[PDB]
Amino acid sequence: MAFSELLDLVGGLGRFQVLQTMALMVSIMWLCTQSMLENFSAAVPSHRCWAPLLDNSSPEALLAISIPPPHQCRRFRQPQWQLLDDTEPCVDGWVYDRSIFTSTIVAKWNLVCDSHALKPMAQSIYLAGILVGAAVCGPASDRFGRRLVLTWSYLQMAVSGTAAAFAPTFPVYCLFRFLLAFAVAGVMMNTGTLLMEWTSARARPLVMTLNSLGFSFGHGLTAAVAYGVRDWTLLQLAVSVPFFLCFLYSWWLAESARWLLTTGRLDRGLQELRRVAAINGKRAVQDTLTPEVLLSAMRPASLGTLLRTPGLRLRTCISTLCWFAFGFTFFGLALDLQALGSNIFLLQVLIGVVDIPAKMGALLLLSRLGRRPTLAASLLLAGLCILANTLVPHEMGALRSALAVLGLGGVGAAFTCITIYSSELFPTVLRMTAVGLGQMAARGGAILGPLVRLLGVHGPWLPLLVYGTVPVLSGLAALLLPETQSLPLPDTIQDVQNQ
Numbered sequence: 487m488a489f490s491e492l493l494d495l496v497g498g499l500g501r502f503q504v505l506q507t508m509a510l511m512v513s514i515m516w517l518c519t520q521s522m523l524e525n526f527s528a529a530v531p532s533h534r535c536w537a538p539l540l541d542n543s544s545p546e547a548l549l550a551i552s553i554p555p556p557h558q559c560r561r562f563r564q565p566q567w568q569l570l571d572d573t574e575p576c577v578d579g580w581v582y583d584r585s586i587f588t589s590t591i592v593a594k595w596n597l598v599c600d601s602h603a604l605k606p607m608a609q610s611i612y613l614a615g616i617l618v619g620a621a622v623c624g625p626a627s628d629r630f631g632r633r634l635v636l637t638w639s640y641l642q643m644a645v646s647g648t649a650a651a652f653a654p655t656f657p658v659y660c661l662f663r664f665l666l667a668f669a670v671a672g673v674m675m676n677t678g679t680l681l682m683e684w685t686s687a688r689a690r691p692l693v694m695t696l697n698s699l700g701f702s703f704g705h706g707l708t709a710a711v712a713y714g715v716r717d718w719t720l721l722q723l724a725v726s727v728p729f730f731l732c733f734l735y736s737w738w739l740a741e742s743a744r745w746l747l748t749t750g751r752l753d754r755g756l757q758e759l760r761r762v763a764a765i766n767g768k769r770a771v772q773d774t775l776t777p778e779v780l781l782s783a784m785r786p787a788s789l790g791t792l793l794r795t796p797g798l799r800l801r802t803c804i805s806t807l808c809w810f811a812f813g814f815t816f817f818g819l820a821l822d823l824q825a826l827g828s829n830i831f832l833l834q835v836l837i838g839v840v841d842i843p844a845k846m847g848a849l850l851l852l853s854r855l856g857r858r859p860t861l862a863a864s865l866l867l868a869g870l871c872i873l874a875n876t877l878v879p880h881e882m883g884a885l886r887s888a889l890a891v892l893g894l895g896g897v898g899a900a901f902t903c904i905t906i907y908s909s910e911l912f913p914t915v916l917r918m919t920a921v922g923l924g925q926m927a928a929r930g931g932a933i934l935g936p937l938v939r940l941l942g943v944h945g946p947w948l949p950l951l952v953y954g955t956v957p958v959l960s961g962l963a964a965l966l967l968p969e970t971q972s973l974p975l976p977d978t979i980q981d982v983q984n985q
């Protein structure tokens with residue numbers, strides 16, 4: 487089933503591939519904005535208990551007499567006039583700090599100091615959504631299309647985001663964040679695969695790196711939009727409309743002809759190849775793509791076949807392990823830069839600006855070393871920066887922050903290498919199912935991150951020890967799965983079993 491011959495008869499690396507890469511990178515930027523805006527639409531302001539002597543009838547002088555030390559969950563039922571020289575719970579409302587953020591979900595639904603474990607839970611739900619999303623968008627994309635799921639996931643992202651921007655109660659907001667996360671999983675996996683299966687190997691790592699840099703630039707776009715737009719409602723709506731645009735233009739993409747011709751469909755694959763030839767101006771071969779030529783090229787995915795198949799069991803388990811390590815470390819480390827600076831937008835900008843050169847260096851490394859050595863190196867670096875950060879004598883001059891940022895760079899490199907490795911490591915029949923299993927593992931790691939952060943009671947170093955031991959062991963396990971370079975993309979189980 488030789489497809490690179492067809493990608494060369496048709497336009498390879500033509501204007502179609504670059505246009506698709508740009509559009510999908512932009513959509514990924516907006517998707518990262520959706521994912522990372524829980525730091526801005528759910529930011530916790532400086533709150534206190536609504537007291538009769540403050541907000542009814544000096545601030546600093548009249549606040550010390552009406553709120554015990556300022557406590558965010560209790561207030562003096564009756565102020566003690568013998569305090570300038572007997573408490574009560576926060577039953578009068580709340581008063582938030584509306585100077586940095588005009589409004590957020592935390593301030594809107596009073597998720598403070600008694601329901602404080604609802605801001606993380608909501609985030610967890612989002613992660614859970616992506617998990618479930620993969621479980622229903624991985625196999626589905628392997629049965630109905632790489633682009634059909636992408637288009638309907640764009641539409642679902644737009645609709646769910648616009649509905650969450652107008653949620654009247656917290657459960658409705660959580661439900662629509664869950665549905666948005668479902669569509670987010672669909673979009674991420676289908677975008678990665680669709681870029682994987684339309685670019686010739688010459689510039690396949692490059693376009694996958696551009697797609698991954700989509701998230702890196704979305705980390706800065708989040709800060710830009712959240713700086714321009716402060717209210718959580720307007721922020722969510724302004725991030726969700728771009729996905730209405732993405733769904734609108736997503737009908738001009740081409741269904742991945744590798745998947746199309748891999749399955750029993752041939753007229754659809756022929757039409758997509760002819761359209762791609764017409765887009766990038768291939769004159770003679772547009773009509774010389776007759777079904778005779780396609781036959782001369784010589785060309786049910788429900789998570790129940792992938793994880794039990796003799797041909798690929800080490801591949802799936804190790805790839806999902808590396809995905810889990812990436813999710814674990816990345817979502818335990820994204821919020822770990824708070825010690826670098828107090829500013830909140832600068833942290834998002836910093837994450838983007840340290841993932842950009844990390845992914846460029848990973849692209850160079852994998853185009854020089856190879857997928858497996860570079861993945862092992864990136865995971866080992868990301869998992870050993872933490873195990874060395876836990877040994878720093880805490881002078882935080884030029885060692886603590888350096889390791890903290892090298893860990894993030896290694897995590898970004900690991901992600902941009904594991905996307906390529908997982909896409910190239912599985913047959914086109916099970917490519918999206920396996921990438922969906924990887925996304926489920928990554929979201930499971932992200933969910934379990936804060937849960938294992940609770941180990942600080944038994945030891946200040948145990949959470950860091952786990953957060954660094956998982957990537958080290960995953961990278962040392964990423965030296966067992968087979969190398970995938972100068973090998974054509976497998977598009978059936980027999981192709982993998984041939985290797």
Ligand SMILES: O=c1[nH]c(=O)c2[nH]c(=O)[nH]c2[nH]1
Pocket residue numbers: 518521522698701702841898901
């Ligand atoms: O689900 C994700 N959210 C991100 O913010 C991100 N950033 C990155 O590099 N990969 C991912 N994946």
